[PDB]
Write an enzyme that holds these catalytic residues in place. Structure first.
Site, PDB file in Angstrom:
ATOM      1  N   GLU B  60       0.823  -1.620  -0.254  1.00 37.19           N
ATOM      2  CA  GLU B  60       0.059   0.101   0.111  1.00 37.19           C
ATOM      3  C   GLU B  60       0.903   1.153   0.208  1.00 37.19           C
ATOM      4  OE1 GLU B  60      -0.623   2.272   2.772  1.00 37.19           O
ATOM      5  OE2 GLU B  60      -2.114   3.307   1.627  1.00 37.19           O
ATOM      6  N   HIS B  61       2.077   0.791   0.673  1.00 31.89           N
ATOM      7  CA  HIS B  61       2.555   2.637   0.835  1.00 31.89           C
ATOM      8  C   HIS B  61       3.755   2.582  -0.812  1.00 31.89           C
ATOM      9  CE1 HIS B  61       2.335   2.423   4.753  1.00 31.89           C
ATOM     10  NE2 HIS B  61       3.379   3.549   4.852  1.00 31.89           N
ATOM     11  N   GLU B 137       5.850   6.269  10.212  1.00 36.43           N
ATOM     12  CA  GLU B 137       4.350   6.714  10.683  1.00 36.43           C
ATOM     13  C   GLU B 137       3.741   5.698  12.189  1.00 36.43           C
ATOM     14  OE1 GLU B 137       1.978   6.043   7.840  1.00 36.43           O
ATOM     15  OE2 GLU B 137       2.472   4.402   7.176  1.00 36.43           O
TER      16      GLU B 137
END
Lengths: 78, 446, 420, 52, 101
Positions: B60-61, B137
């Site tokens: 997803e990154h 994150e």
């Protein structure tokens, strides 16, 4: 192109403030909560100046000099 | 004039078609000049097998960092060259890549979506720098304390199951994961029968079907080992987890029980129950006159900073409960109050209360689908979960079935005399033990 | 499909706009030109308490009746205040909305403003200000507004800390009776017939026919504020005087902010087509966030750059962004970048009115400003009617104007305004 | 001075709490006849009639 | 008639709270409605009521009453608490009739 908040793309919710008097069905994301912060110290009532005779000498003329002590009260002189 | 049922049936219908690859293409049309087109994949943290525990998050990154035909930021430049917005998310069960754009550029965006789900160029330098970004994150999301209690509640409620692990996974898996593992995850879980191409807004359905036939033809379609990854029911565990850090100013506590999942109708009834209790934070401007009893009690006694009820659904399972942030000295009192509210819904629910909850649920269901992004989200998630798009008139018909007797029967079925799952974080020693919380989940007077 | 939007100008100056679209739930909003523009040094923060006074007792309904009656039908009442105007918005399922309308009517026409209720509410405005200033962008934008203007726009959205406990009911009554007049309001209804709005407006919008008190005329001063708070990040907004709304130069400044980069388009993106992000990413090997700030009002405008950077590498980021704006102020730009900037601006405008809230806010502001509908296609062709020399002269007007600077954080390496 | 509870909601609460209060009264009556060894009811029951 | 007014002022003299300098509204028992109406009072009426109550307590401690020229009379007995109390019972009755249904 009106709606001055939507003129700015990312700066829409910063230029505006949106309170909600009656909160509806959908909750807002990031509800948010204040931390239990501290309290300022209490001080006595000060001296008001209601006449020209009391106000004389109150205007500063010299640089600020602070003084603390072990058993003398802390003072500031101008 | 036009009453509620006529306006509910005047909403346009979602058209769903099936390609030869099993790709489910669905869209619905409005008068809007924009559009929201997305791909929803049935791949999340529940399909990961404790050694590739952050594979979906790391794809997803890297999905936006370059493809085979669009190497790197040039792809990024392309979407900025049309002024479109590109977003993604990854849950425990679903992954979504969605784009808001204009309707007049419907072809190009679909082409972009195509390679994003099937032609991602996974480079080693990009793998290194996105490993550092993911570590950054997770450090950032450790500060978001309600997300921490969310993860803790999932772990302690779904112990031993693949639904306890977070979507981003542990830090060691971020430090050690290799390109072959990501290739295995994407070859296993990014096949075409699990993908829904959803479109909302001013888009022709036949045009989108022609685009999906042109671009998203032959995504995978093949298991390559005849090995279907099937989901297995997860054991719920009545449990308590207590992360204690007294340096924090406020405490977050989440209490939950089982909810049935996506495909059981009494979820609607449970939704009404949440609409009875509702949400509050300190900036709500009602005062001492809010309709929710817990909100008025917490305002009068100055207990909360915020509270919020939730119903969370996965494949035949879910978490139903509440979550609050408050200071230490309030915590125990609120738990009592919160449990009392649940027991009231188990025992002595009235009719005006149910009517108010029904109107709140009607407004929530209609006003949530305002704009093409949540409509497209509802389309993709509904085709992945229910197998079909449930229309809002069907929702209104199911809400109208709710009266007080069946509501308190359902609330007694799901709340009364049940072991909760309790997660806490902060100054939480006034939060009681599991025995007092468990004993508060039933009344000695019934 | 709906019919076109319908307008009515009542003899007391009230504008009425209505769209009949047979929505499942309806949105009713009254837009009043009664923001924080209209205060002075004596009644600061009156608009903040008036923003939170939307659930107090009126005549015709108490606080209990308003709260329980709006929550009983599931409807929602909110109010959004910008520095120029306020908007009171109720929403709810269609078959109830008329009763919701009279609630909004009371809140907008006859507040009682009792003393004990506002004495209860002042603590709530302190808590609301704390929640709002929990993030740093709000604090630095309010400081930048207090520095850039000397009157009528330096008044913040939130009440100052000395004024809390001192706003009385008389200031609220004065503010309402001088700014909530019928010649400064627009009643907009999405999902309601025009005759219902006209009937309610003829019923109870016939009390204050004057134009109210107006003519504050905000002036520009410039300067800098530097809040040392010792954070790891340094925020810095550097702006200058720019054109107001009602001009083609405002379109030029919007094209200018989307050319230089006006926020993200890609989740975890690099902002490649942003010129400022391109320059700083060529400079700095540390995380940053550079964007273009453009707050356009009806009398003046602020345009500049907003930078977030590390504490030690703040000077390089700020100087690189300023030199990028200087380089694009000297004609050094490409027309494909301007075309992409126009596409970004029109896509953002069409996505803004995509939802019902953005559409209602846009038509409320349009009815307050001109009193007539601007269709979206006319906005798009006005965007398309902007040349490259207009953007060049907009950046030249930025670089030649005296700047207002607001900085927040560890400012050891942050420059001063003499070193830009 | 008990006119605050004259409405449909309190009637709804009342008809909700009929069976629980009736069952608690049944518990109280059975416990009273069990503890007192009352001869009116304990002669009407089959198995407990063994000591008489 | 005026007979009822004269009989009410005779009863006002016979009840005896006028001799302690008290008003009629000072003699109300502090229920929740009365306490809320005290809380909604302006500060000068609050200070006047608290001084009147304290002076009456002092006089009853000494088993004495005031001299007659500072007694409260039937005509200047102002009814300061009546509009606040009326609004408090109207709001409480509205909340009660809402909660009944």
């Amino acid at each position: 192109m009106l709606s001055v908040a939507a003129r700015s793309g990312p700066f829409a919710p910063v230029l505006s403030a949106t309170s909600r008097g009656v909160a509806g069905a959908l909750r807002p994301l990031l509800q948010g909560a204040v931390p239990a912060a501290s309290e300022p110290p209490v001080l006595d009532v000060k001296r008001p100046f209601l006449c020209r005779e009391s106000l004389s000498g109150q205007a500063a003329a010299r640089p600020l000099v602070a003084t603390v002590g072990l058993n003398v009260p802390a003072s500031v002189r101008f | 004039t036009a009453t509620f049922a006529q306006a509910l049936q005047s909403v346009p219908e979602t058209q769903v078609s099936i390609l030869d690859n099993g790709l489910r293409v669905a869209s619905e049309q409005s008068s809007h000049a924009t559009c929201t087109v997305g791909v929803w994949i049935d791949a999340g943290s529940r399909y990961e097998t404790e050694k590739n525990n952050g594979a979906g998050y790391f794809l997803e990154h890297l999905a936006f960092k370059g493809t085979k035909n669009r190497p790197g930021n040039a792809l990024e430049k392309e979407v900025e060259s049309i002024g479109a917005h590109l977003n993604a998310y990854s849950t425990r069960e679903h992954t979504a890549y969605l784009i808001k754009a204009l309707s007049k550029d419907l072809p190009k965006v679909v082409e972009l979506l195509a390679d994003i789900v099937q032609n991602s160029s996974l480079e080693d330098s990009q793998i290194e720098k996105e490993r550092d970004v993911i570590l950054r994150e997770m450090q950032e999301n450790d500060a978001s304390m309600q997300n921490v209690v969310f993860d803790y509640l999932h772990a302690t409620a779904f112990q031993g199951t693949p639904l306890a692990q977070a979507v981003e996974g542990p830090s060691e898996n971020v430090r050690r994961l290799s390109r072959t593992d990501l290739t295995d995850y994407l070859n296993r879980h990014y096949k075409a029968p699990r993908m829904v191409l959803a479109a909302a807004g001013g888009v022709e359905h036949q045009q989108l079907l022609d685009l999906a036939q042109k671009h998203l033809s032959s995504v995978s379609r093949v298991y390559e080992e005849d090995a279907v990854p099937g989901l297995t029911p997860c054991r719920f565990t009545g449990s308590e987890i207590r992360h204690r850090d007294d340096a924090l100013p406020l405490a977050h506590v989440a209490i939950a029980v089982e909810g049935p999942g996506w495909a059981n109708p009494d979820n609607v009834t449970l939704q009404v129950a949440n609409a009875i209790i509702g949400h509050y934070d300190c900036t709500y401007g009602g005062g001492v006159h809010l309709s929710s009893p817990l909100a008025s009690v917490a305002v009068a006694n100055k207990l909360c900073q915020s509270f919020q009820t939730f119903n969370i659904s996965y494949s035949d399972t879910g978490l139903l409960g509440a979550h609050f942030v408050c200071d230490a000295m309030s915590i125990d009192d609120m738990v009592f109050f919160l449990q009392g509210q649940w027991m009231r819904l188990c025992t002595s629910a009235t009719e005006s209360e149910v009517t108010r909850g029904k109107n709140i649920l009607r407004n929530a269901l209609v006003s949530h689908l305002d704009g093409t992004t949540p409509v497209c989200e509802d389309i993709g998630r509904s085709l992945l979960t229910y197998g079909r798009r449930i229309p809002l008139a069907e929702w209104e018909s199911r809400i109208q079935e709710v009266d007080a007797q069946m509501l308190r029967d359902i609330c007694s079925k799901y709340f009364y005399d049940q072991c909760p799952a309790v997660a806490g974080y902060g100054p939480i020693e006034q939060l009681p033990d599991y025995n007092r919380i468990r004993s508060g989940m039933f009344w000695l007077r019934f | 499909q709906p019919q076109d939007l319908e307008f009515t100008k009542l003899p007391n100056g009230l504008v009425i706009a209505s769209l009949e679209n047979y929505a499942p739930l309806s949105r009713i909003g009254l837009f009043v030109k009664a923001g924080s523009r209209y205060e002075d040094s004596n009644n600061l923060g009156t608009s903040h308490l008036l923003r939170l006074a939307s659930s107090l007792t009126t005549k015709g309904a108490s606080s209990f009746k308003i709260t329980r009656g709006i929550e009983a039908v599931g409807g929602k009442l909110s109010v959004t205040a910008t520095r120029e105007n306020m908007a009171y918005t109720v929403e709810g399922i269609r078959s109830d909305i008329e009763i919701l309308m009279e609630f909004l009517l009371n809140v907008t026409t006859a507040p009682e403003f009792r003393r004990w209720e506002v004495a209860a509410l002042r603590s709530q405005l302190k808590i609301d200000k704390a929640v709002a200033f929990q993030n740093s962008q709000t604090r630095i934008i309010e400081n930048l507004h207090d520095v850039a203007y000397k009157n009528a726009l330096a008044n913040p959205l939130y009440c100052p800390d000395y004024r809390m406990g001192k706003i009385t009911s008389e200031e609220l009554h004065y503010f309402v009776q001088n700014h909530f007049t019928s010649a400064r309001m627009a009643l907009v209804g999405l999902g309601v017939s025009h005759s219902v709005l006209k009937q309610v407006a003829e019923q109870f919008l016939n009390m204050r026919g004057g134009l109210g008190l107006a003519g504050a005329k905000a002036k520009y001063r410039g300067g800098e504020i530097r809040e040392q708070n010792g954070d790891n990040l340094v925020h810095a907004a550097i702006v200058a005087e720019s054109a107001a709304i009602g001009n083609a130069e405002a379109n030029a400044f919007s094209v200018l902010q989307h050319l230089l980069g006006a926020g993200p388009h890609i989740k975890r993106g690099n902002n490649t087509t942003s010129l400022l992000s391109q320059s700083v990413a060529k400079g700095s090997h540390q995380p940053f966030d550079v964007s273009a700030f453009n707050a356009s009002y009806s009398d003046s405008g602020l345009f500049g750059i907003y930078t977030i950077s590390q504490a030690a590498a703040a000077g390089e980021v700020i100087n690189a962004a300023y030199n990028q704006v200087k380089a694009v102020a000297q004609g050094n730009l490409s027309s494909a970048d301007v075309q992409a900037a126009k596409n970004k601006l029109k896509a953002g405008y069409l996505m803004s009115v995509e939802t019902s809230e953005g559409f209602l806010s846009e038509i409320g502001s349009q009815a307050l400003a001109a009193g007539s509908y601007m269709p979206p296609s006319t906005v798009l062709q006005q965007i398309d009617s902007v040349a490259d020399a207009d953007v060049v002269k907009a950046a030249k007007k930025f670089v030649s104007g005296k700047k207002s600077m607001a900085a927040s954080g560890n400012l050891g390496h942050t420059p001063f305004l003499d070193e830009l | 001075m008990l006119s605050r509870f004259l409405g449909p909601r309190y009637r709804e609460l009342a008809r909700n709490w009929i069976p629980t209060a009736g069952m608690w009264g049944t518990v109280g009556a059975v416990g009273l006849v069990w503890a007192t060894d009352w001869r009116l009811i304990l002669d009407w029951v089959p198995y407990i009639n063994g000591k008489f | 008639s005026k007979w009822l007014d004269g009989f009410r002022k005779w009863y006002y003299n016979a009840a005896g709270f006028n001799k302690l300098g008290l008003m009629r509204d000072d003699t109300l028992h502090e229920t929740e409605d009365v306490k809320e109406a005290i809380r909604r009072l302006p500060e000068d009426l609050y200070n006047d009521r608290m001084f009147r109550i304290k002076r009456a307590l002092d006089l009853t401690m000494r088993h004495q009453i005031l001299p007659k020229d500072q007694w409260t009379k039937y005509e200047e007995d102002k009814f300061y608490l009546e509009p606040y109390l009326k609004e408090v019972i109207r709001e409480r009755k509205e909340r009660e009739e809402w909660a009944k249904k």
